């Protein structure tokens with residue numbers, strides 16, 4: 001076409017505005033595209049589906065079973081039709097499974113709505129400007145690239161049995177107004193550069209609107225550590241959320257500066273609705289952590305790029321560290337990585 005963006009940026013645009021990718025994500029969740037295509041998807045419907053799951057949360061809280069639920073599930077599946085070859089919403093933590101789907105549908109709705117929004121510019125540049133984000137290619141021979149590559153290589157070996165990783169492209173990203181929304185928290189201590197993985201169908205929403213919290217109608221019990229923004233300090237953890245496969249091996253993971261401050265440290269799931277005061281975030285303690293001996297500090301921001309070693313933390317259910325903040329202003333996105341996954345099987 002007639003694009004003036006660098007070639008890696010053009011490919012990223014085509015990747016995140018891929019409507020076929022959006023449909024496959026919905027099919028992956030067994031949503032019936034015939035009864036509800038990508039065009040029919042709406043925020044008010046996702047909002048009402050969230051609230052239905054919140055009714056199941058109250059119902060499970062008050063202690064009921066199997067005839068309140070089937071009605072609540074019949075309501076859920078009527079609003080969002082599925083195509084099975086109808087599981088119980090009150091068992092096997094299905095509230096979490098459905099609430100993650102709604103999270104991804106919210107981003108897929110934003111991507112599709114943005115895509116349907118002059119002769120001068122190639123549609124690639126038109127869609128790029130809709131993100132209201134400045135994306136520049138990081139030179140592979142730069143100091144930034146070497147730090148980021150080392151961060152990747154040091155924190156993915158523990159999953160080599162599942163897959164290997166190769167950094168294709170590194171982008172520096174600057175969301176419009178995010179540096180301004182984050183400025184108050186740069187005074188907070190304990191700021192770290194952390195990973196956030198996601199499917200490619202989520203990043204049109206991530207770039208245009210930043211990382212968000214689940215809406216108020218979302219069930220707090222649908223999130224392992226409450227309705228917040230989740231980060232990891234090892235790509236082995238965040239890369240799992242790209243949902244790449246051998247037939248879809250290219251994933252996206254971002255690096256973001258997170259103001260953690262005083263961390264409420266936990267060793268198992270806790271559907272937090274409010275933090276204790278003095279605490280600014282949650283840190284789920286994992287069995288594996290980057291070697292603190294290799295931690296480097298950057299403009300007062302810690303980069304825990306050490307090789308994965310055992311943390312010595314017994315009595316924990318988490319394999320990797322988790323970091324959750326509950327204010328969207330506590331996050332400043334800085335880098336976006338394009339990664340090729342090489343699977344063993």
Ligand SMILES: O=c1[nH]c(SCCN2CCN(c3ccccn3)CC2)nc2ccccc12
Pocket residue numbers: 100103104106107195196197198202211212213214215230231232237238239241322323
């Ligand atoms: O690195 C990690 N990545 C992800 S992604 C989890 C799924 N995403 C879906 C989209 N979503 C929202 C939010 C608000 C509004 C619309 N969508 C946020 C949730 N979880 C992680 C969890 C633990 C550690 C690292 C990670």
Ligand code: NI
Pocket residue numbers: 156157160164165
């Ligand atoms: Ni490797």
Ligand code: NI
Pocket residue numbers: 221271
């Ligand atoms: Ni629970």
Ligand code: NI
Pocket residue numbers: 243
């Ligand atoms: Ni999954």
Ligand code: NI
Pocket residue numbers: 268269270
């Ligand atoms: Ni507990």
